Amino acid sequence: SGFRKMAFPSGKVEGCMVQVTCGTTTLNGLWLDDVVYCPRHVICTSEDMLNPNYEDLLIRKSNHNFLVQAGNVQLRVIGHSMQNCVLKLKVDTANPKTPKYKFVRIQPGQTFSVLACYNGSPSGVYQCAMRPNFTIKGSFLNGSCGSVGFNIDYDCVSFCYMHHMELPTGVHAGTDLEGNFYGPFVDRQTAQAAGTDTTITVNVLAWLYAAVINGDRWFLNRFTTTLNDFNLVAMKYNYEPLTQDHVDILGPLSAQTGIAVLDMCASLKELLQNGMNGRTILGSALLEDEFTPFDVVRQCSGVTF
Amino acid sequence: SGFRKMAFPSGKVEGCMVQVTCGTTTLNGLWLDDVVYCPRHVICTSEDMLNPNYEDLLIRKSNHNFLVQAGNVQLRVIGHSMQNCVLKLKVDTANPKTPKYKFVRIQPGQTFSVLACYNGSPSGVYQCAMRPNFTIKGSFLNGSCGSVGFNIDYDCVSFCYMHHMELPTGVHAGTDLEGNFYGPFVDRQTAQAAGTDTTITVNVLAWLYAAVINGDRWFLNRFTTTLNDFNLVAMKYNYEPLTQDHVDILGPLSAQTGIAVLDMCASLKELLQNGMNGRTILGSALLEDEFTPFDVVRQCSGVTF
Ligand SMILES: CC(C)(C)[C@H](NC(=O)C(F)(F)F)C(=O)N1C[C@H]2[C@@H]([C@H]1C(=O)N[C@H](C=N)C[C@@H]1CCNC1=O)C2(C)C
Ligand SMILES: CC(C)(C)[C@H](NC(=O)C(F)(F)F)C(=O)N1C[C@H]2[C@@H]([C@H]1C(=O)N[C@H](C=N)C[C@@H]1CCNC1=O)C2(C)C
């Protein structure tokens, strides 16, 4: 028993992190086979970042201008190209620690682990969710760009996020590994803000199932509800609509606990309308929305990789 | 910016986890150089665990009765001994992935990362604190014993916890790597409970400094307090006394933010006496006590390993 915000083991990703330096700008790169992926603003001075022309800055660089370091070994760069907001540095050595991997673009509400890195070295790992407004609530300082977010399926690392920048409220924005930003953001130092965020309803329900599994049951009420009546209530409280797809994804937890999804929705509806009356669920005074149904099943069933 | 519950990168520990099987009991072991460490109740049947005589159970085992598996390779056991509540299996192969390491016994209030494992394979990583009552608020299922807790200092892994059992309330108990339990617990399946827990005051203060660093400043008041008057108030709310040692350890954060430790104590004293009036600090409605001062400095200054 017990329920914790849990990250994937980071070793497979740790063996891929490198330092990339251009001029005096240094950040992190991801070394897979013979390619290093990193944010394109490695090629900017601080002044360039206010309004950069990346294509123009890159034209003036050659391979030897990129200093890539894997531990104490410098990797010789033998080609370079830009793909959207990421640079790809071809190097003359394949990373022998390359895991089986894929590049994926995740959807809002999905979670992933972040390996926060500085100067190519890992600092910590934490679990994040892609918010409905396409930001993540991360923890990042200067030099953290190029840190990546990932999921693991058995032996395969699915890379889904590379870190580029911090927005007002101290939230974070980045790209998939093809360099396309999540959300309507650009890699330029000019005022930008995220839209209003919303609560990931399907994840709250998953977390309520985790609570029941752990014996935290006080919030269960005697009632059911229709999907449409639940969604009318949730809307007022800035909760995402619950779709039939979400209901299906909640099936395994519903079947395991013996609580129909719409019955749990009736319990959540009461929690939203009445509040928690000074009580906690799994130790939390606020409803938690950064566990997916899959996260709950994995943690309560001990899936390994 | 941003502040997250952050674990150490787990790769160094991942390369040490193995499966240990005796009869039909299977759990996790830690393979360092040519020794595998694991909880001694691997040698018990389910019936043995109700009231085991470990010395007697071990006398009837020989080396070949222990099946140790590292990935797809079986490790030949060539010796065995018991040290308090842990078994040490000498094997004929040194682990080539052994990191620089030390065994440490941590104190209540200190934090560490847990690599939760099943069948010798890592499932997830999360950050824990040794509670004042010598339990940890973990997440563990059947087969998780032998999962270890650790800190990392540059390149050195300090192993501090090995998991053995779950207590009422769904909290967890275990040993250091010399097999000595934290707290007054024994590895026998009989009713045991932890003492009343208390709040780690020095860690709450560290977390309040993290809040200020991130611009969450509403709780700062105009007042100071003496150490003794603060400790009288904290006592009523089941907070650990704050010692001069704790004040000194808070020095770096105090100096960085320009807020004297006793002034932050005056702010905490008001929070305890008046509550949070429906506000949050770093997104939390409850005061958080599982970040040490060192954790805060590391996360807000990006120390790497
Ligand atoms: C926060 C700042 C005001 C500095 C700026 N943000 C905005 O200008 C915004 F308003 F658009 F968001 C911003 O992040 N950058 C400005 C410049 C890069 C990016 C940046 O410094 N990236 C860092 C990479 N190592 C990670 C950062 C550092 C602090 N915490 C992080 O996560 C580029 C967009 C090219
Ligand atoms: C919780 C249970 C009632 C089963 C029992 N507890 C008490 O009897 C107590 F009351 F003393 F705590 C207990 O944990 N054990 C009984 C038996 C071992 C230990 C045990 O099964 N260890 C597991 C190792 N893989 C990890 C566990 C599994 C569930 N979650 C965990 O963390 C030993 C003490 C020798």
- Gaps in chain A after residue (C–N beyond 2.5 Å): none
Determine the longest span between alpha carbons in chain A, in angstroms.
69
List chain B residues with CB under 8 Å of A199. Answer: none
Which uninterrupted H or E stretch holds B258?
A: none
User: From CA A204, how far away is CA A190, in angstroms rounded?
Assistant: 34
Same domain, B156 and B63: no
Q: Number of Cβ pairs closer than 8 Å across A and B?
A: 156
User: From CA A21, how far away is CA A34, in angstroms rounded?
Assistant: 17
Pair of tokens at residue B190: 């009989």
How far does A245 lie from chain B, in Å, by closest CA? 27
Identify the nearest ligand to the CA of B192 by its number: 2
| CATH number of residue A21's parent domain | 2.40.10.10
**Strand bridging mode B100-103 / B156-167:** parallel
Same domain, B137 and B4: yes
Nearest to B208 by CA among B52, B3, B54, B26: B3
Ligand 1 contact via A49 beta carbon (within 6 Å): yes
Contact B15 A15 (CB under 8 A): no
List chain A residues with CB under 8 Å of B172. Answer: 2
Identify the nearest ligand to the CA of B47 by its number: 2
Q: Is B284 an interface residue toward A (CB < 8 Å)?
A: yes
Same domain, A61 and A145: no
How far does B63 lie from chain A, in Å, by closest CA? 28
Same domain, B119 and B192: yes
Domain boundary among B197, B214, B244: B197
User: From CA B96, how far away is CA A82, in angstroms rounded?
Assistant: 39
Ligand 2 contact via B165 beta carbon (within 6 Å): yes
Phi first, then psi: give them for residue B295, nearest 5 degrees. Answer: -55, -45
| CATH number of residue A248's parent domain | 1.10.1840.10
State how many domains chain B has: 3
Resolution (A): 2.0
Close Cβ partners of B201 (under 8 Å, ≥ 6 residues apart): B234, B239, B240, B241, B242, B246, B268, B289
Same domain, B219 and B124: no
Close Cβ partners of A184 (under 8 Å, ≥ 6 residues apart): A134
DSSP state of B292: -
Interface of A with B in 136-175 (CB under 8 A): 137-144, 166, 170-172
Which of A26, A189, A190, A192 has most ligand 1 atoms within 8 Å of CB, for mutation? Answer: A189
Residues of A that are catalytic: 41, 145
Interface of B with A in 117-136 (CB under 8 A): 117-119, 121-126, 128
Question: Would you call A73 exposed, middle or buried from its count of C-beta atoms within 10 A (0-12, 13-18, 19+)?
Answer: exposed
Following DSSP, what letter does each residue of B175-196 receive, concatenated?
Answer: E-TTSPBSSS--SSSS---PPP
Judge contact between A163 and A101, C-beta under 8 A.
Answer: no
Same domain, B175 and B211: no
Same domain, B143 and B8: yes
User: From CA A305, how far away is CA B99, in angstroms rounded?
Assistant: 21
Same domain, B4 and B110: yes
Same domain, B82 and B123: no
Same domain, A92 and A21: yes
User: From CA A103, how far away is CA A179, in angstroms rounded?
Assistant: 11
User: From CA B40, how far away is CA B57, in angstroms rounded?
Assistant: 10
Nearest to A209 by CA among A128, A291, A277, A270: A291
User: From CA A234, how far away is CA A199, in angstroms rounded?
Assistant: 9
Which of B20, B171, B189, B192 has most ligand 2 atoms within 8 Å of CB, for mutation? Answer: B189
Q: Is A90 an interface residue toward B (CB < 8 Å)?
A: no
Domain boundary among A99, A126, A144: A99
Same domain, B164 and B116: yes
Same domain, A209 and A269: yes
Following DSSP, what letter does each residue of B68-126 receive, concatenated?
Answer: EEETTEEEPEEEEEEETTEEEEEESS--TTPPEEEE----TT-EEEEEEEETTEEEEEE
User: From CA B61, how far away is CA B179, in angstroms rounded?
Assistant: 19
Contact A2 B122 (CB under 8 A): no
**Which chain B residue has the Cα nearest residue A12?**
B11
Pair of tokens at residue A150: 């990932």
- Domain extent, residue B295, equals 198-301
Annotated catalytic residue B41: yes
Contact A143 B171 (CB under 8 A): no
Close Cβ partners of A16 (under 8 Å, ≥ 6 residues apart): A30, A31, A32, A95, A97, A98, A99
Chain A interface, mutation test: which of B3, B4, B5, B286, most A Cβ atoms within 10 Å? B4
Task: State whether the Cα torsion A122-A127-A130-A131 is positive or negative.
Answer: negative
Judge contact between A16 and A97, C-beta under 8 A.
Answer: yes
